[PDB]
A = this chain, B = another copy of it.
């Protein structure tokens, strides 16, 4: 919890290093790698920023027509699964806890209401994730609670209330 002079943005290379457990300390929570990594860059991180003044992170995914999920979901009718945008938000909550200096391995613990009101199609350009923290709890289990939004090409299409993620010392 003594970590200061924090970076406010991260590149794709940084996100891949995180997947290897090589961005933060070896004890920090890694992002998923490969086909489960659902963003290309983190554009903004602010401690005590965001809609509740308790933390903010903004990230982006470039929507390339060759993204793996388009081919299989659904065949000949490509659309990004909402569940993967939801996971992207969970991953960002966990990442933010690690960014503060939290040690452990991340596990999504749940979410309140999730609404999918639009779709991400291959013809889209960019998905944006906006995460607004409500609670940061530095206990034996480090826990983050946040509200999230997913935008496609600048318009909000998903909302999630009370995303919850924990960092476990031992799973």
Distance (whole angstroms) from the CB of A149 to the closest CB of chain B = 13
Q: Is A44 part of the contact surface with B, judged by Cβ < 8 Å?
A: no
Per-residue B-contact encoding for A54-93, CB less than 8 Å = 1, 0 else: 0000000000000011011111110101111011001000
In the complex, which residues 25-40 of chain A have their Cβ closer than 8 Å to any Cβ of chain B? 30-37
Asked whether any CB of chain B lies closer than 8 Å to the CB of A112, the reply is: yes
Q: Are A75 and B21 in contact, with the CB atoms below 8 A?
A: yes
B115 touches A68 (CB 8 A): no
Flag if B36 contacts A73 (CB, 8 Å). Answer: yes
Give the residues in chain B near A112, CB-CB below 8 Å. 112-113
Interface 9-residue window, one of A45-53, A102-110, A124-132: A102-110
